Design a protein around this ligand. Structure first.
Ligand SMILES: *c1cc(F)c(C(=O)NCc2ccc(F)cc2COCCOC)cc1C(=O)Nc1ccc(C(F)(F)F)cc1C
Lengths: 12, 248
């Protein structure tokens, strides 16, 4: 949740 | 074993993850080992070994145990970012279903954080602030419950792992093998993940054979570690919620 947020942003 | 087209392509893939890895994690295991072992021209880290050395070290929360955990938290966020960045340079990964890319990194970052920490650890403690500081194992242990115990399983794992003497060339492909684990819960297209992992596992075996003449079954024992790391990250995840329930 806090994790998926940051991971999708980094993938961007 | 023969040096042939397939072997030379496993070597190019190893080299491509190595460069990509040196990009994403500035503080490499090599410069981490020169700093721990004193063999560097670089600045000497400041040792936090008691409450007094921590004060000068800092040179908001009132509680030094909380404040350290917060610092640990932020680096983790940055680490999750660096691991994702690395993952983008693993041939095949950006092409996978976006949701699957997310489950992989979701369920993998904690295993990769344990691995990268070992690189920054000796028996005395862990490098902090990009090598600018060093915090002793026994002082981190000296923090009140439940913080005193947070890093100890990291040190336990790091003590036996570092004994394998893996370098950056090995570690890059170790980490790529972890990220493409076809057993992470809720993975929409497994068969494609396992295809990248099979290529990565050949790249790993060739690497370790060429790089470790005295460790005949080191490939087998890196797989045992990737197993070790499943229960470790569970134990970390489950105490990491204890702190969410008991610390405001
Ligand atoms: C230190 C404290 C800490 F609380 C964590 C941690 O794992 N927090 C959870 C977290 C972290 C980052 C993030 F984006 C989301 C979340 C929430 O996730 C839920 C958990 O369930 C799956 C971690 C540490 C720690 O490991 N600190 C750290 C990591 C890596 C390095 C590096 F130097 F090796 F790169 C250094 C440190 C200090």
């Amino acid at each position: 949740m806090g994790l998926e947020a940051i991971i999708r942003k980094a993938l961007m | 074993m023969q040096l042939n087209p397939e072997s030379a392509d496993l070597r190019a893939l190893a080299k491509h993850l190595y460069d990509s890895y040196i990009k994403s994690f500035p503080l490499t295991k090599a410069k981490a080992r020169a700093i721990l072992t004193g063999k560097t021209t670089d600045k000497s880290p400041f040792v936090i070994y008691d409450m007094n050395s921590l004060m000068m070290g800092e040179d908001q929360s009132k509680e030094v145990a909380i404040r350290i955990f917060q610092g640990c938290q932020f680096r983790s966020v940055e680490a999750v970012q660096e691991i994702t960045e690395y993952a983008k340079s693993i041939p095949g990964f950006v092409n996978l279903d976006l949701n699957d890319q997310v489950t992989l990194l979701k369920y993998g970052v904690h295993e990769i954080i344990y691995t990268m920490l070992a690189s920054l650890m000796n028996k005395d403690g862990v490098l902090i602030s990009e090598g600018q500081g060093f915090m002793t194992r026994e002082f981190l242990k000296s923090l009140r419950k439940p913080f005193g115990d947070f890093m100890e399983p990291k040190f336990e794992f790091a003590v036996k792992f570092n004994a394998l003497e893996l370098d950056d060339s090995d570690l890059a492909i170790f980490i790529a093998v972890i990220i493409l684990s076809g057993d992470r819960p809720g993975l929409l297209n497994v068969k494609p993940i396992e295809d990248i992992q099979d290529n990565l596992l050949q790249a790993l075996e060739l690497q370790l054979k060429l790089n470790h003449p005295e460790s005949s079954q080191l490939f087998a024992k890196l797989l045992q570690k990737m197993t070790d790391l499943r229960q470790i990250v569970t134990e970390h995840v489950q105490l990491l919620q204890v702190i969410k329930k008991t610390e405001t």
